[PDB]
Subunit: 387 residues, 4 copies
Amino acid sequence: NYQPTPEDRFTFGLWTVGWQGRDPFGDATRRALDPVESVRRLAELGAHGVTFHDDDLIPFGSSDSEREEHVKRFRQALDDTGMKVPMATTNLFTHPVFKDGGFTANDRDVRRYALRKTIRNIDLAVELGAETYVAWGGREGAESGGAKDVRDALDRMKEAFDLLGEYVTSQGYDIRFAIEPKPNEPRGDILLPTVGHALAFIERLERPELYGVNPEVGHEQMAGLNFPHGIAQALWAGKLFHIDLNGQNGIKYDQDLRFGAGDLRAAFWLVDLLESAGYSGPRHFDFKPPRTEDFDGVWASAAGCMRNYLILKERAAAFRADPEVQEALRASRLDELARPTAADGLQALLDDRSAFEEFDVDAAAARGMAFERLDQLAMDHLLGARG
Amino acid sequence: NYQPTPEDRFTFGLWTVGWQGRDPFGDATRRALDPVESVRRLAELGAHGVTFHDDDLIPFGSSDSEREEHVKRFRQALDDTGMKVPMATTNLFTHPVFKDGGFTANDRDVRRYALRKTIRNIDLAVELGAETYVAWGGREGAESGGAKDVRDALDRMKEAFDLLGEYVTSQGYDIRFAIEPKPNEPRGDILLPTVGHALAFIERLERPELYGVNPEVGHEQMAGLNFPHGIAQALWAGKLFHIDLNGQNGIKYDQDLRFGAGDLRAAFWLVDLLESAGYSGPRHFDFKPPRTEDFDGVWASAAGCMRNYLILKERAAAFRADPEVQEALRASRLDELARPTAADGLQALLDDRSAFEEFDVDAAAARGMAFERLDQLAMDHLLGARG
Amino acid sequence: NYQPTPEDRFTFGLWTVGWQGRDPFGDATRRALDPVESVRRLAELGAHGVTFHDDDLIPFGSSDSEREEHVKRFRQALDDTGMKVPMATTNLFTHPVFKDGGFTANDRDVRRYALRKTIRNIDLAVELGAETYVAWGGREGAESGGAKDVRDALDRMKEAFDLLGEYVTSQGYDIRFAIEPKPNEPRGDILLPTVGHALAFIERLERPELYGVNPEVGHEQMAGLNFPHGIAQALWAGKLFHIDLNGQNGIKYDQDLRFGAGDLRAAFWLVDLLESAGYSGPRHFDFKPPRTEDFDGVWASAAGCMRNYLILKERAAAFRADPEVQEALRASRLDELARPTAADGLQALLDDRSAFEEFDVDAAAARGMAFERLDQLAMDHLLGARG
Amino acid sequence: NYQPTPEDRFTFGLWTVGWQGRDPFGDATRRALDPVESVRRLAELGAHGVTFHDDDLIPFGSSDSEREEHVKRFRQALDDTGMKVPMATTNLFTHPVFKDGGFTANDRDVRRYALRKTIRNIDLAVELGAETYVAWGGREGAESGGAKDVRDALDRMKEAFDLLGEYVTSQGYDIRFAIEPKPNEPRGDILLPTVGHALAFIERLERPELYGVNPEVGHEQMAGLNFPHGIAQALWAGKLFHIDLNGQNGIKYDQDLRFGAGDLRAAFWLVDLLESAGYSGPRHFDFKPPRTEDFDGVWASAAGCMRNYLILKERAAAFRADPEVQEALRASRLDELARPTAADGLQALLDDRSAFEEFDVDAAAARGMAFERLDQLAMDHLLGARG
Ligand SMILES: OC[C@H]1O[C@H](O)[C@H](O)[C@@H](O)[C@@H]1O
Ligand SMILES: OC[C@H]1O[C@H](O)[C@H](O)[C@@H](O)[C@@H]1O
Ligand SMILES: OC[C@H]1O[C@H](O)[C@H](O)[C@@H](O)[C@@H]1O
Ligand SMILES: OC[C@H]1O[C@H](O)[C@H](O)[C@@H](O)[C@@H]1O
Ligand SMILES: OC[C@H]1O[C@](O)(CO)[C@@H](O)[C@@H]1O
Ligand SMILES: OC[C@H]1O[C@](O)(CO)[C@@H](O)[C@@H]1O
Ligand SMILES: OC[C@H]1O[C@](O)(CO)[C@@H](O)[C@@H]1O
Ligand SMILES: OC[C@H]1O[C@](O)(CO)[C@@H](O)[C@@H]1O
Ligand SMILES: [Mn+2]
Ligand SMILES: [Mn+2]
Ligand SMILES: [Mn+2]
Ligand SMILES: [Mn+2]
Ligand SMILES: [Mn+2]
Ligand SMILES: [Mn+2]
Ligand SMILES: [Mn+2]
Ligand SMILES: [Mn+2]
């Protein structure tokens, strides 16, 4: 059971399985993977596709012809396997020139360079068939309060994304942008640190319809936030364009554990939500096989990502289909939450004495919500302990 | 030095100095304060004004005539002292009926009751001259994932605020709404948990211009977020309608320490920002004198709030006026952050070979940002150690 | 399946199911429970026993004869049901007199009073057959740095516990003490904030053998610590005298969720450890049924505590009995971790050239730990997805 | 003012100022520093000394004669400048062989290698005159629960430290060990994660007198703990052998900011404590100049460490010498905290009716602690705002 196939739409970044294990306190524990080899290994495990930063696919500073050759070999592997490229992104974080940011570097020349590097990869992404272009502003931020005027920085951020929107519109490209929040690391505080901040920012862009969010499980958890709540807000706004799936154990460094590790209950409620809402985008994993692992462990970790999603999907589906759960949901008045509070309108509400003057506050207060019983039914379903 | 006067616009909630010291593990340590007495004591310390929830001023369940009498006595104290009431709010959290929320309770009758309780206090607030009406959804949330469908809850939240907006518009009242985020406590996760989430939500209301945010120092810090960054985003959006000032030591329960306690450097950078941006609203303190304190300690704690703001204001002003700091800010290219990245437009950027083909990436990378020197000048100014 | 019986040794505090739902922002949602009624309800659910603070059983300020009568009625219920009282504790936190602590209050008279209140309840506990007496220093701490000289406070803490040890020794009582850490709440920082700090402190008492720890799942998680690691250290030291079981979602206020809620994987690894190590003490639940719940929800929440332990016990047992897991544990060299590094002694180690001069560092480095495969087998067992 | 001299005993690790700026998301921004150059630059800024890991001074895998030459050149720089080497440590974290630990690696051969690498550097440290040898178990831990049996791991940890203690005793070396805790990073959870856990562990070693702690400001703050409280416990136990000074903004990745940055009030209370208790060891800075900085910024950041200590020292000293503060400390009964609760003994306490039967609980409860006034005097002193 729980065998993935390409129709489950599981995708992986090249940088995930290709992570060599260099951390801030130690050297690489694994050799570099050829992108072609990752493509084939992932196809064999049942993945749908891969994603890339520019610099994962084409070594930084490659000539135009080295570049052609890298793309050609990759494209051949995609053709041989049937793997897709639904998303791409830019590396605006590794090279030293990006030490104070890309789009919001204090140096204007760096900001211009960041835009040009990005635009060149948008052309490549469209050529490979990507529908979503992710921006992760990992260096946009500060360690000290005087270093970054945040209002000016947001003006620069909006300028950058507006220009990118003008570019795609002018070229007639069919690609949308997704902003990936993260609250900190590697900068002390990162700009647009949560899904909320990103959603609010998007509404001030010149063409807000071209921009959504790419939330990551572990990033929101680094701020102690409820990830399924955040995703529900993004879905409610119509802005869940892509998602990064992984695990995280609490408020600490960005662990990027395989999906299902970390906060397992939150993973269950995330799956429940994605599947109930009909999210139809890629189930993308942004994870790092731990540096303890050899190559066999790398592939085992990747497989476990997919396995854990398909297990949780089954459990959530059983939960929602259970008539005893359906009855519980009514006992807890989930049905009533979905009805309008005042479809009769404001004047009717104001004239309704059962809403205030004659509302029996004590009787309403005495009614239990029956949430603990509901939650235990959810636990029993997750654990497969329904007698 | 550092004596406040009413022109500094310092305000306090009645619930702040009036907090009796009941916590989840212990009984009250102080007797209840009469609102009239708080008004006079605060006027003597140099405050500008007070704020209230409905239930702080009028005991829950008062008759129409007890209500009149409470308001009359309060109004007399305001007239005797010259104190203003710039803000008011509703208690939709204390009474048991609000155990699952007000605006987003699963029970529809409770939601209607929450709206009616709110509207009655909006009329009172306008009569007392409040310009801002705060909403803190402290019970809107969940302890378990199945208890609250978050999409439906946001539909209900938007319904409630839309109706309030219709009400104020229809009455011709000159009052705006400010949403006060908090990430958790007393619910396991609270809806709209940060300034970002609140800002994004506001953009989906029918009349977004009537709604802003009332961010609180300690609340954003409960998610480990940078408070001055959050306020800069709110100012950038034009939505900083009011602010709650206090202190918080990290990610834990909501401490509500006096302003300046907690993260002192963040307090300095907040003051710097508010004063540089010309925020002209109330400097409102939402703090709890610790339960260790008697009445003399209560007034000492309140006075310290004001004192610490005026000290930090002086230090920030000295920082920004220091020519050596002005030179540092140029050395760190803050000037350049404020200039447009590409006022020449997209086509010019694309044709500019100095932005990419001929950009010397190594030379740009080698340039230091000089941020540590700048930050030490900021430290020296804060500490009054400029030789 | 998963029906508890008294032989599973599940115990509950009277304050758990008896929590009325008063939180720092709201009033009680449930009426007070008679201790006799809790005893009978818990006996019917299959619990083994109950625990109490002095003030849960005997209202503060009771006369000697009211006291007798309270104890008599409780004792009758214990006799009627077969319920035991394995643990007792003192309330040194609720009454205002304890606002700055009990054992470490700055006022010496309060400290003496705290000792006398404690000793009176130790006599009661011994009469009811308790084997463990818990001390939770919830008020021992500070909100500000100058308020508490911590060295003097630790001298006072050690003085208090030494005196209690002298008391029990002098009376010939067969009772041991267990210190329950918590890092913060209701004080800004609490003394002995983690299991580590408590263990270290115990070693400086005059009779360290009489003192152990009473760690609580949610408390260690409030500091972002791994609870099963902490318990392993306490077991290694021979100091796990009692345990508090509950759930907690990350670094925030003390939630006291039912056991199994919160961090579900950590619950699995805790059960695995307790059962593998042969912990033979009570499985005590210190939880709060959420205030959303009526009485039916209270009992459902309590039942779920027990259910979730018995499910996890079964899953952990299946994990460790699985031959494929046993083989995995060898592949990951858990066997080798259990062997002495240098049973040959220091000189032999120093003369062993295969340990250094001729150690092939590259070959050792290339070996994968196979941890991800092991962890996925653990996941599959937890979820009941072993094909 | 605030010019350091070698008598202030400020020390720096070679790895601090020598950090090249490689982080988990980016390449180095600065070239490698020769240790000789760091020694001379630091001597010019007024430092007392430097500290080293084996691998900072002697490139891993050096021959015996390269090794001699590295040590000779370093020793010459020490002789030229008058700089001391008070502390040394081992790198048991960088090389891939240490991916699962040094002392607690599951592979027994790695554990033996870790011991031999350590012993070789203890000989070097003694030759250079170090009095303290630090052990930071950065790789001792796990990402998953099944990977590390923690009891066995602690047996292995104790074995390793016992053997080191036997080694130094047998050689007659005058050097003590200090364990440096950290709660996580680069492992998901690290063993002995706080000062408490380390202190408790030390008490189970064969010769506990040879072992103390090397607490780091930012590490304890990564668990949300109060650093001055932790240090007070270490001083109370007589185990503060060395300290790492730096700054950290809350619960996140290990920032290693310059001292005084981060939580500035905690820095003030730490300085107050160190100076009041007469700590006479090195004031060692374990900080990372941010990667935004060039070499000029590196030296500015290092200088700021020292400056900020000397400013805080002056402010704390002024605080404690202020007669108005001395009077406040009596008003808050700090004097009484320092007196024994029951120097009269247990029987006298039991017979003292003023301790219980006739204690007026209400009168004691009504007395305010006056802590807020005290804390504001502390604030005013820190800020230099005493009129
Ligand atoms: O944006 C693409 C990716 O870039 C980097 O690898 C980030 O660490 C990751 O979280 C993000 O998803
Ligand atoms: O909204 C008004 C106030 O209501 C409550 O007292 C909250 O605890 C507080 O943070 C908020 O500012
Ligand atoms: O010590 C007994 C109990 O006292 C209080 O109720 C605490 O909140 C709880 O954690 C502790 O277990
Ligand atoms: O133990 C010596 C040092 O080793 C490493 O550099 C650690 O990151 C640091 O915290 C520690 O102080
Ligand atoms: O470019 C205008 C900008 O200039 C600043 O005052 C920089 O000093 C900003 O805070 C504002 O967005
Ligand atoms: O009222 C329509 C709503 O109904 C739900 O499906 C409730 O099941 C929501 O998730 C959506 O906002
Ligand atoms: O009672 C002796 C004690 O006195 C203090 O100096 C109080 O000033 C302590 O820090 C020490 O433990
Ligand atoms: O070496 C004895 C050790 O063996 C284990 O059971 C390993 O299975 C430990 O938990 C204990 O410390
Ligand atoms: Mn991540
Ligand atoms: Mn990601
Ligand atoms: Mn607050
Ligand atoms: Mn507030
Ligand atoms: Mn608890
Ligand atoms: Mn407990
Ligand atoms: Mn560190
Ligand atoms: Mn350190």
